[PDB]
Design a binder for this molecule. Structure first.
Ligand SMILES: Nc1nc2c(ncn2[C@@H]2O[C@H](COP(=O)(O)OP(=O)(O)OP(=O)(O)O)[C@@H](O)[C@H]2O)c(=O)[nH]1
Ligand SMILES: [Mg+2]
Ligand SMILES: [Mg+2]
Ligand SMILES: [Zn+2]
Lengths: 47, 242, 145, 1111, 94, 323
RNA sequence: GGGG
DNA sequence: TATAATGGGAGTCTGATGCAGG
DNA sequence: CCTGCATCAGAGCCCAAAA
């Protein structure tokens, strides 16, 4: 189907959670030795 | 929104406020005015402009080295149709090194650009004529050649100005450019309705010089009854021709 | 005075946008509030539905606003949010649950769409070309059961 | 050839050392050549004396010393090292509790040293520190714009050394004080100083209603201690007003000679303005337990006396160059030094609390990291520390004398308005009125005037000759702006007989205002016209004939002249071009008298009278910051007898010691077939043939081989899947051989890098299996040649780890540098200009047979369109050509000084003498007047150019005195229908050359977040098609062209991949899809907790992520 | 100037409608390899190579020339769009 | 003849124009800036007048304000006088002089620039805005004095800074205009409105306290290319409802007005158009670049913003009044 | 800072 | 993982609009 | 009711941009 309109509206905390693929539990970014992402951190591939 | 309320959060040992979500969306550098209402584009180039008196109003000088890059995908396809390379991948490998470019490749590019137009733009683009379409004429050399009559709409000099080139890709773009955007199809100002491409500078200078008439002081308004008397008076050198 | 020939035609286009809006003096029998600001078109459109519904129509006032304020008030929130005052525009839009109908140029530019002007206008957009050979060829097979 | 100098002005003093503003400022700050006990308290010394002693325990400062540089200047530039000296400081530790004294000399890091010519070397690159103009500290009184009869007194100290103060007098009648933008009644502060109602009444009172309006009873109802506590609660709400805490805050803000610094200039301006004498640089004191006022009461006293209209009280003009001072290199560096020293003190006081109050020496107590970072921060990143402009020797000389009003402690771009950008009357003789940037920075950045020097306080001074009676002495007095306004100053060109003023009426100035005055009233006189203009402006001959807007372009562009291999000095000079080469330090001179023993391409050895055989090595083909070649050439021969100060080698862009920014060419002023249109220039192919306007340029290429987690990058000659044709010019190790021609695409340094987990996809696995070649462990990362670049490889430097003297940044095994040179012939699109501001690009190169030529067969060099002259009003170029015509035939060059120059009659005498050689040769050679010369003469008498009734020789000479000659068109052979102006002009080849600027891209690199093409030629970027460009496409209604710009040619990923595939297959490009930078916009609004929904006509959601983001 | 551009603006109610007819026509020609053209062999636009004369590859030039002849019919709702595509691919293959 | 031929005409005018300019023998030498004999006379006249105003000051007849004001007026008139002298001397005694030829034909130059070459430089301005009483008597041909040069530098710098700060104000202005009008497009042929606007051909004049004809170019700017709202008969010509006014039609209406037949013209205008989200063909009028009715779909709002914004650069109230 |  | 230690250091100018105040 | 008065959000384009 073709895009005819763009609406913008407030997002409930339920909906904010409706988008989310996981909770970021740690301030960690990536592992200092392997350089791969830290599990449950900001770059985690599981999320 | 960082800095909105209270002290802006900074990285340690720097005065630079960190760039928050609000700063990314808004402002001159923001998402809207940088990447959304305008963009950097492919199939474009830029160089110094030089005057090209010999061009017709619908033409521009385009350096061959610039044209080879802008039309590179077209040049690859055409190089296979004739025969300079076995396939598209090998043809590209040949253009990579400048000494691997043979002379038949230049003839190949000429076939490609036939009838197509390119866009010339010079900043600042103040009205719709800051961009016009021209059919390119390949030239040796590193300079763009610009037609004299269009310098006014562009506010172009040859004091070192540069212009940008763009290649409309599709049949649709090319049509819009050749009909709507061609320099020769826009001769009058959309603002005043008066002529825009019009004589100026040397052109005016030459035409005024040949159409001005001499007025000489030697004769100084004498009366002569018969015209044959007058020619005689001029023959004596008493009265000037004009 | 500066020696610039310019057609009034253009200045009138802008001034027309300056007068685009009105302020309600009495709602009569409508949902509007006294002092509410709205486009002159929308209240004229509303008033023929009221005068055709018989209830007393909305009383309105001419309103003159400069180009900046006028620009910020257009119904399209993508136009306004890309201009200026981005947060303010966007917060009021998100609250209202605003819908951008993609009427103007900037909205469509942002989405990368084919703008509603030139070759993109709906007037010229759908025009077809066919050669007389193909026109008659298609025509003969279909003129039957 | 002979050099004929005009002008009657005898300049009593030469130009000062031109880079002295740099050299003298820094030498004064470091005082490295002064013995420590004899140092005055200034610069570095003053910073130490200010920060120490450090209280708790007491650490006291003894003295500092500067070592010698670890590496010489040349070596530093090579290795990307900073040219600097080790700094040590002797400190004695005292225990305020015990008596213990431990003393040691602690190492504080390195300080960068200035070279002889006034520049720096910071990480291998030569840099300049630009002086900063700003408001002088002191006490100023300006009118309050709101109330037309009241005034504000503002006390402004040196930058970052205290708050700004405003003393507005409020509508209620009480005198208010403004500090840190907060206001309160000033009476309260007066009581803290220990003032009583009597002192204020008796001192001031004379102003009936004003002094009584300051009086507030509630404030007097408390001794000086209670009033101090009361004020503190106003300035710091919520902080408990403890008596030691309040004293500390107010002391540090007002009386502390550490946290509050008026200038040394501030002290003088304050003492002079208010008629008081200051004991120090602070507004008040802490003495005998209470506060004692210094400034505040005299400042209040002057304000009331001014409001009342008392004689001797005036408002101050804040743009006057007496109230505006310059902050030079030493001062800028010292400010950053002072900050770094105070930070180190924080470390000292904090360490005097933790870890045992006894077992500490000064060496363990001091961490120098804060000091080193502050100095390194200033030199590597301040916005007054700039990459040196060394395009040609004049470029750097001008750079060092620039004055900026921008930078850390000055105006911003968005923060700046008209008063500051104006040319003030006091700029006369001090700041050049011409040399300023055109555009946004106009008036903020300027150039030091030629005869000006900056005094010890920081005010610019200019020389004038004393005039006693009517006799002009030779004693010269350097004056500040404030002191200059007292006297009556006659113009420099006023007629003189001997030492006597010879005119009955003289042209003079009183406070910048021009006035006619009798010789009895003349107190001083200008030294020279040269003192009013910058160094670049002084290089423009016939400047008195050029409109200022164009003269500006002449000045600025000489900075941009590229050094030419055949460079020559102009045939018409101003007489400064000799001094500029000498002060620049580009050339080379003999130290003492002597005889030249040896002369080489690489070196010159001179035997002096002393007997010492001093050897001067010559810098040959060194690459400047802008890539122009700085190279010195020998000017003497073996055995030549030289005196002290005679030339040994010529530097770049200098010829026999005169500044050579260009070449002298024979020019014809006339339209040529539209190749002249709108400033373009037509040139003769004869110029390239004889290598005029050819310049050498070097570009630097660099590559590192580093350790990775996947294995080492290696620089090797073995590169996967490349033919021997491709590797031919590479040596054994993978480096290109010195003396090879390299063109775009060619390998400069071969390098391999280990392949990522992209370890070849199964598609590649099967292909590789077919050919029976194992997929290699390493991929070809070799350094190559960018599009459009290339040349001859002239040098290679290779630096590894584990070689003597070299350690790279962590992880880096080796660094290779390749220097590639090119000889650039003039070509179509390169840019030329003369010294009067005529500038244009070369649009046509005609073969010599097409060039217009003189009757005797000589073709002209340049054809300039006359349409450039009349609107521009730069006529100096016209007079320059005429005197240039005479000089072409007489074989001479001239010195015509500015404003005291060759005038029209004198040039006419010279032009007539030339005609004899241009014509008399012919009459003797057995040729008479030409047929075509008569036809032109016919046309000329209709124009009133020649007088009717004279022989052809008489008429041709009449034209030659108007600077016009007969010119034959090489195409037709027929004459130009009129006589044409022809002569010798000095024209330079500027730094803007098409080879550098031509760029184009089909597809290329994209940005990380936006996926749009990158910017700039070096990244192979795309052009920016911006907001205004979209409007252009919109107004034309070209929607599909516009949509292409917004999608397939930028960030629409599916579309751009698909579009390329179509062009190489011969299909048409597909209709575009959603641009990726819009998807970024959507997700960024979601990060702001806003729901952005694309909808169809039925109001149902449309998924633009094609299922990828939904669970 | 494009040849006979003034006559082309004559044929349309809106200049932008001219651009669409031309653009769409050029796409018809490219997809079908020019063999649906209404031009005759001597009216074919030619291109001078180093070898010699060949057919003008630029279909947009072709479309304007074709339009000038009068043999093309332009308007709205002339034929369902999909059905046109099949009849043209039937008469002049790809 | 139309566009295609006009392109050919333009290229032809281009071709021959260049060729003749080269062989014509146009040049500029220093002697081509001709100081008129009238200059010395006009300067002598100016000094006796200035001396007379000084007598009225130190004798207390006129104020400091009055004296300064009178001096500026005297020197303004002397400037004008010397210009006419430059151009009269050129026309009568040297009509093919290069400076003269370039200025008169419009190739380059204007009277005031030529006056600075051959005349006096004239009055220069102080850093504030008030003018120096002492003028620069020299011309670029004669050459200036360092003091004359310095006095002149002040105005140069102020001009340069003014222009720099103006392009930003103009630039910003243009961006506002595009944003307020961007949605406006010609969306249909006729909205059907019965409304219109009456363009006045006469402005009430204050000096005559009655009426005078508006200036030509002004009327052209209000009339050319507009559709007539009602029929208009003047001088026996029928201008019908719905007719686009040709430039000739406009000249006819001006002539009828000079003859007292018509004082104002009913005309369709975008102010009164009823089209939603844009205008219609009739209320817009000609597409001025093609000198013919605008095509439906032309993005007219953008063209209005660009037409208004582009001149912003060159405006000396000035641009602040427009904003 | 530099180009239009 | 145990003497006792108890409150911080630091920097222009325009026009539009929503607010505590004679 | 009206007016001072602050807090905020604006201040041209493209290219080198020498980190
Ligand atoms: N917007 C903008 N334009 C610039 C800038 N720098 C240079 N320009 C261009 O510089 C050009 C100046 O051209 P001029 O040579 O002064 O044009 P002119 O009116 O003919 O003046 P003369 O040539 O002396 O007669 C303008 O067309 C501008 O577009 C800039 O920073 N911003
Ligand atoms: Mg220019
Ligand atoms: Mg120009
Ligand atoms: Zn309408």
């Amino acid at each position: 189907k073709e895009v005819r309109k763009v609406r913008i509206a407030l997002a409930s905390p339920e909906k904010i959670r409706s988008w989310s693929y996981g909770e970021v539990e740690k301030p960690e970014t990536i592992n200092y030795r392997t350089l791969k992402p830290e599990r449950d951190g900001l770059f985690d591939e599981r999320i | 929104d960082n800095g909105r309320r209270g002290a802006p959060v900074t990285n340690p040992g720097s005065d630079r406020p960190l760039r928050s979500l609000t700063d990314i969306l808004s402002g001159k550098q923001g998402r809207f005015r940088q990447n959304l209402l305008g963009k950097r584009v492919d199939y474009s180039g830029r160089s110094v402009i030089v005057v090209g008196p010999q061009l017709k109003l619908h033409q521009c000088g385009l350096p061959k080295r610039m044209a080879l890059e802008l039309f590179k995908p077209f040049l690859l396809k055409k190089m296979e149709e004739k025969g300079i390379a076995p396939n598209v991948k090998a043809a590209r490998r040949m253009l990579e090194r400048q000494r691997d470019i043979k002379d038949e490749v230049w003839d190949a590019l000429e076939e490609v650009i036939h009838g197509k137009v390119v866009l010339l733009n010079r900043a600042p683009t103040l009205h719709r004529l800051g961009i016009q379409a021209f059919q390119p004429v390949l030239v040796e050399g590193q300079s763009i050649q610009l037609h004299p009559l269009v310098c006014e709409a562009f506010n172009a000099d040859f004091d070192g100005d540069q212009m940008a080139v763009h290649v409309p890709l599709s049949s649709f773009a090319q049509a819009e450019a050749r009909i709507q955007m061609l320099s020769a199809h826009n001769l009058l100002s959309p603002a005043s309705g008066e002529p825009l491409a019009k004589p100026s500078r040397d052109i005016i200078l030459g035409l005024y010089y040949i159409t001005q008439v001499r007025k000489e002081k030697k004769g100084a308004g004498l009366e002569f009854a018969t015209p044959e008397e007058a020619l005689a008076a001029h023959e004596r050198g008493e009265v000037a021709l004009n | 005075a500066q020696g610039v020939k310019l057609h009034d035609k253009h200045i009138e286009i802008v001034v027309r946008q300056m007068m685009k809006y009105v302020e309600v003096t009495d709602p009569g029998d409508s949902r509007l509030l006294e002092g509410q600001v709205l486009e002159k078109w929308d209240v004229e459109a509303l008033n023929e539905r009221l005068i055709a519904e018989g209830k007393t129509p909305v009383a309105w006032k001419p309103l003159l606003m400069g180009v900046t304020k006028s620009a910020l008030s257009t119904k399209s929130w993508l136009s306004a949010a890309s201009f200026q005052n981005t947060t303010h525009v966007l917060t009021e839009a998100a609250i209202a649950g605003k819908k951008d109908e993609l009427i103007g140029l900037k909205e469509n530019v942002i989405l990368g769409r084919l703008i509603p002007a030139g070759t993109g206008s709906d007037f010229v957009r759908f025009t077809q070309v066919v050669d007389q050979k193909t026109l008659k060829a298609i025509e003969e097979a279909r003129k039957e059961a | 050839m002979e050099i004929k100098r005009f002008g009657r002005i005898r300049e009593v003093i030469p130009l000062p050392p031109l880079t002295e503003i740099q050299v003298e400022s820094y030498r004064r700050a470091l005082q490295a050549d002064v013995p420590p006990e004899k140092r005055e308290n200034v610069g570095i010394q003053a910073a130490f004396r200010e920060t120490f002693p450090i209280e708790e325990l007491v650490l006291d400062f003894l003295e500092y010393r500067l070592g010698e540089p670890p590496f010489p200047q040349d070596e530093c530039r090579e290795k990307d090292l900073t040219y600097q000296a080790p700094l040590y400081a002797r400190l004695q530790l005292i225990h305020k509790d015990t008596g213990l004294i431990k003393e040691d000399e602690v190492f504080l890091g390195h300080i960068p040293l200035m070279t002889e010519d006034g520049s720096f070397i910071i990480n291998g690159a030569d840099r300049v520190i630009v002086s900063q103009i700003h408001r002088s500290p002191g006490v100023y009184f300006t009118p309050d714009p709101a109330r037309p009869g009241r005034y504000i007194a503002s006390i402004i100290p040196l930058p970052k050394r205290g708050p700004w103060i405003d003393l507005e007098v409020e509508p209620n009648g009480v005198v208010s004080m403004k500090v840190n933008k907060r206001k309160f009644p000033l009476v309260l502060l007066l009581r803290v100083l220990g003032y009583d109602q009597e002192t204020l009444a008796r001192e001031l009172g004379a102003y009936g209603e004003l002094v009584q309006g300051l009086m507030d009873e509630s404030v007097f109802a408390m001794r000086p201690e209670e009033a101090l506590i009361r004020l503190f609660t106003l300035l710091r709400p919520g902080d408990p007003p403890k008596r030691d805490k309040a004293v500390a805050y107010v002391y540090g803000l007002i009386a502390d000679p550490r946290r509050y610094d008026l200038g040394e200039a501030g002290r003088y301006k304050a003492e002079e303005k208010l008629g008081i004498r200051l004991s120090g640089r602070t507004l008040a004191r802490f003495e005998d337990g209470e506060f004692k006022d210094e400034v505040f009461l005299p400042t209040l006293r002057y304000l009331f006396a001014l409001t009342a209209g008392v004689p001797g009280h005036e408002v101050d003009d804040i743009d006057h160059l007496g109230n505006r001072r310059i902050r030079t290199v030493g001062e800028l560096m010292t400010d950053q030094f002072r900050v770094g020293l105070a930070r180190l003190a924080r470390g000292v006081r904090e360490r005097m609390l933790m870890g045992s109050e006894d077992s500490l020496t000064p060496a363990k107590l001091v961490n120098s990291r804060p000091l080193e970072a502050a100095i390194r921060e200033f030199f590597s990143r301040s916005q007054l520390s700039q990459f040196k402009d060394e395009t040609n020797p004049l470029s750097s000389l001008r750079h060092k004398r620039r004055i900026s009003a921008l930078g850390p402690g000055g105006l911003t771009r968005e923060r700046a308005g008209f008063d500051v950008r104006d040319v003030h009357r006091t700029h006369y003789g001090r700041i050049c009125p011409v040399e300023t940037p055109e555009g946004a920075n106009i008036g903020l950045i300027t150039s030091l005037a030629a005869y000006a020097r900056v005094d010890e306080l920081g005010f610019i001074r200019t020389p004038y000759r004393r005039v006693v009676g009517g006799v002009v002495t030779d004693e010269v007095v350097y004056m500040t702006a404030t002191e200059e306004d007292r006297y009556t100053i006659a113009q420099a060109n006023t007629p003189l007989e001997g030492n006597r003023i010879a005119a009955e009426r003289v042209v003079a100035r009183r406070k910048g205002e021009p006035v006619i005055v009798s010789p009895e009233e003349v107190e001083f006189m200008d030294v020279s016209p040269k003192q009013v203009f910058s160094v670049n402006t002084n290089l423009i001959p016939f400047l008195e004939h050029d409109d200022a807007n164009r003269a500006l372009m002449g000045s600025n562009m000489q900075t941009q002249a590229v050094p030419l291999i055949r460079a020559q000095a102009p045939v018409v000079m101003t007489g400064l071009e000799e001094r500029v080469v000498r002060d620049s330090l580009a050339a080379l001179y003999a130290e003492e008298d002597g005889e030249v023993a040896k002369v080489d391409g690489n070196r010159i050895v001179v035997r002096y009278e002393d007997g010492r055989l001093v050897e001067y090595p010559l810098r040959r083909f060194y690459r400047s910051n802008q890539g122009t070649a700085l190279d010195q050439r020998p000017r003497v021969v073996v055995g030549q007898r030289v005196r002290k100060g005679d030339l040994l080698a010529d530097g770049p862009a200098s010829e026999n010691g005169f500044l050579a920014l260009g070449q002298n060419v024979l020019v014809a002023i006339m339209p040529f077939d539209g190749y002249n249109f709108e400033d373009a220039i037509v040139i003769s192919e004869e110029l390239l043939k004889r290598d005029f306007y050819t310049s050498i340029h070097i570009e630097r290429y660099e590559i590192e081989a580093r350790d990775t987690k996947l294995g080492p990058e290696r620089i090797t000659r073995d590169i996967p899947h490349l033919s021997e044709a491709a590797l031919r010019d590479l040596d054994e190790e993978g480096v290109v051989r010195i003396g090879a021609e390299v063109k775009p695409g060619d390998i400069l340094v071969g390098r391999t890098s280990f392949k990522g987990e992209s370890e070849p996809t199964p598609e590649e696995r099967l292909l590789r299996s077919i050919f029976g070649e194992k997929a290699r462990d390493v991929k070809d990362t070799s350094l190559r040649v960018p599009p459009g670049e290339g040349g001859i490889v002239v040098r290679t430097v290779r630096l590894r780890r584990g070689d003597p003297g070299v350690e790279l940044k962590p992880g880096v095994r080796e660094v290779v540098r390749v220097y590639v040179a090119q000889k650039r012939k003039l070509q179509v699109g390169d840019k030329l200009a003369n010294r009067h501001g005529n500038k244009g690009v070369v649009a046509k190169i005609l073969p010599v047979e097409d060039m217009p030529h003189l009757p005797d067969g000589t073709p002209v060099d340049v054809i300039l369109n006359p349409l450039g002259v009349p609107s521009r009003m730069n006529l100096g170029q016209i007079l320059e050509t005429h005197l240039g015509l005479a000089g072409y035939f007489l074989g001479q060059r001239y010195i015509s000084p500015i404003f005291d120059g060759a005038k029209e009659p004198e040039i006419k005498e010279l032009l007539a003498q030339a005609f004899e050689v241009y014509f008399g040769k012919r009459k003797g050679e057995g040729f008479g007047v030409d047929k075509r010369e008569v036809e032109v003469l016919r046309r000329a008498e209709k124009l009133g150019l020649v007088t009717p009734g004279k022989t052809p020789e008489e008429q041709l000479k009449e034209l030659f005195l108007q600077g016009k000659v007969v010119l034959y068109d090489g195409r037709t052979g027929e004459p130009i229908e009129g006589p044409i102006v022809v002569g010798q002009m000095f024209i330079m080849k500027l730094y803007h050359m098409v080879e550098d600027k031509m760029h184009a891209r089909s597809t290329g690199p994209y940005s990380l977040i936006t996926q749009q093409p990158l910017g700039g030629k070096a990244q192979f970027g795309g052009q920016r098609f911006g907001e205004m460009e979209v409007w252009a496409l919109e107004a034309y209604g070209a929607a599909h062209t516009l949509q292409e710009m917004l999608t397939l040619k930028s960030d629409d990923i599916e579309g751009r991949n698909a579009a390329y595939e179509a062009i190489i297959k011969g299909e048409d490009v597909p209709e575009p899809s959603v641009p990726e930078s819009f998807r970024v916009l959507v997700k960024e609004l979601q990060a702001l907790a806003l729901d952005v929904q694309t909808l169809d006509e039925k109001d149902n959601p449309v998924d633009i992520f094609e299922g990828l983001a939904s669970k | 100037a494009e040849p006979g551009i003034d006559k082309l603006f004559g044929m349309v109610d809106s200049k932008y409608r001219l651009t669409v007819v031309v653009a769409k026509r050029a796409q018809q020609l490219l997809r079908h390899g020019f063999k649906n053209t209404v031009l005759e062999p001597e009216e074919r636009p030619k291109m001078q190579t180093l070898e010699g004369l060949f057919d003008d590859p630029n279909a947009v030039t072709w479309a304007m020339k074709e339009l000038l002849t009068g043999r093309l019919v332009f308007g709205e709702n002339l034929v369902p769009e999909d059905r046109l595509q099949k009849e043209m691919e039937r008469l002049y293959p790809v | 003849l139309g566009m295609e031929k006009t392109a050919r005409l333009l290229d032809a005018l281009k071709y021959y124009g260049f060729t003749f300019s080269t062989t014509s023998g146009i040049t500029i030498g220093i002697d081509d800036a001709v100081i008129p004999e009238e200059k010395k006379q006009y300067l002598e006249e100016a000094d006796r007048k200035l001396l007379q105003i000084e007598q009225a000051y130190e004798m207390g007849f006129l104020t400091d304000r009055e004296r300064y004001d009178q001096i500026l007026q005297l020197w303004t008139e002397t400037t004008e006088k010397v210009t006419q002298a430059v151009f009269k001397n050129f026309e009568e005694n040297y009509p093919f002089n290069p400076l003269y030829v370039m200025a008169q034909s419009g190739a380059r130059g204007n009277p005031q620039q030529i006056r600075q070459l051959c005349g006096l430089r004239g009055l220069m301005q102080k850093p504030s805005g008030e003018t120096f009483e002492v003028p620069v008597r020299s011309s670029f041909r004669e050459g200036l004095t360092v003091l004359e040069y310095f006095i002149s530098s002040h105005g140069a710098r102020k001009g340069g800074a003014d222009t720099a700060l103006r392009t930003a104000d103009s630039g910003y202005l243009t961006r506002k205009l595009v944003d307020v009008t961007h949605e406006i497009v010609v969306r249909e042929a006729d909205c059907g409105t019965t409304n219109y606007i009456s363009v006045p051909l006469f402005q009430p004049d204050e000096v005559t306290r009655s009426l005078r004809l508006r200036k030509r170019a002004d009327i052209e700017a209000g009339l050319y290319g507009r559709v007539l709202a009602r029929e208009v008969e003047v001088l026996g010509v029928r201008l019908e409802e719905g007719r686009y006014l040709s430039m000739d039609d406009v000249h006819l209406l001006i002539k009828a007005a000079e003859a007292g037949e018509i004082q104002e013209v009913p005309v369709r205008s975008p102010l009164t158009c009823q089209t939603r989200y844009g205008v219609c063909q009739k209320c817009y009028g000609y597409d001025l670049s093609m000198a013919r009715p605008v095509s439906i779909g032309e993005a007219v709002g953008i063209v209005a913003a660009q037409s208004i914004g582009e001149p912003g650069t060159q405006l000396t109230q000035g641009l602040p009044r427009v904003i």
